[PDB]
Amino acid sequence: DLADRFAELERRYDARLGVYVPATGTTAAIEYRADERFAFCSTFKAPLVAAVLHQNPLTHLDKLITYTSDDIRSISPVAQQHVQTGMTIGQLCDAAIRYSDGTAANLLLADLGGPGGGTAAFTGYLRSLGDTVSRLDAEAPELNRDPPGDERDTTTPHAIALVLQQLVLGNALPPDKRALLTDWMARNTTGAKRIRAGFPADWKVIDKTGTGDYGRANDIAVVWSPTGVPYVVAVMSDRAGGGYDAEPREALLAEAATCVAGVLA
């Protein structure tokens, strides 16, 4: 019956929906179009910040990064502010997660190194976590504007949820680094209308969102029941039939999150 309700939301919203919640000791995995590819958009910024944390000393966070006004290619609510000053790797991390800053991300990719301005190193980091599916080929803003049916810059709800699970709930990062990432997602400012809206207020929610053309809207979160039981929730959608200028349906992600909550409840 769960499939039928996702299928209905699909039709109600003229959208394609993809959902995944990893299995636990007491609940089966939830999955709808869990293995079909969807555009990363900005949801990569989260495992990116963990790439940066993994490969470096804590100390590295204090390193100041200098950029110019022409480095600003995409929505950068924070970067443009500190161009005169620049930002530490820490302030870049913070903004790539909490505000989805396109430049902050573009910088951190570069701080990873190698071909494709960081993106080879980043897909390298996903590989190191067992994810053989996902791939980041381009950097902001080109990665939110791939044609529907294009492999590049995509992931699955399945693949991103297992990744996110290792980062926050698992052992991918040492505890010190673990709480940095987690704390940054808990104070994310871009997701109030998505998964977080679809879950009762007494469930704790951390997340990182993604938005793109063709009516792309994503949200990936780690939720805690009132009793403290964690689950990983990955919700992705596009609306290809509305074309490039199609509008993202936030209410789709919020509703699908409510269906998910009722089943976990």
Domain ranges for the chain, please list them: 1-265
How many other CB atoms are there within 10 angstroms of residue 75's CB atom?
A: 17
Query: Domain 1-265, what architecture?
Result: 3-Layer(aba) Sandwich (3.40)
**Number of Cα atoms under 13 Å in the Cβ half of residue 12:** 13
Give me the helices (H) in the chain, please.
Answer: 2-13, 45-54, 89-98, 102-112, 119-127, 157-168, 175-186, 250-264
- Pairing of β 30-32 and β 216-224: unpaired
- Pairing of β 154-155 and β 38-39: antiparallel
13 DSSP assignment: H
Cβ proximity of 123 and 160 under 8 Å: no
Residue 129, classified by CB atoms within 10 Å of its CB into exposed (0-12), middle (13-18) or buried (19+), is buried
Q: Catalytic annotation on 69?
A: no
From the list 10, 42, 100, 134, the catalytic residue is 42
Quote the CA–CA distance of 62 and 194 in Å, as a whole number: 32
Residue 56, classified by CB atoms within 10 Å of its CB into exposed (0-12), middle (13-18) or buried (19+), is middle
Quoted resolution (Å) = 2.6
Tell me the three state secondary structure of residue 90. Answer: helix
Q: Catalytic annotation on 142?
A: yes
| Cis preceding-peptide flag for 141 (omega within 30 of 0) | yes
Quote the CA–CA distance of 147 and 123 in Å, as a whole number: 20
Cβ proximity of 45 and 105 under 8 Å: yes
From the list 8, 36, 128, 142, the catalytic residue is 142
Method: X-ray
Intra-chain end-to-end CA distance of the chain, in Å: 16
The CA-based dihedral angle spanning residues 185, 190, 192, 198, taken in that order and rounded to the nearest 10 degrees: -80
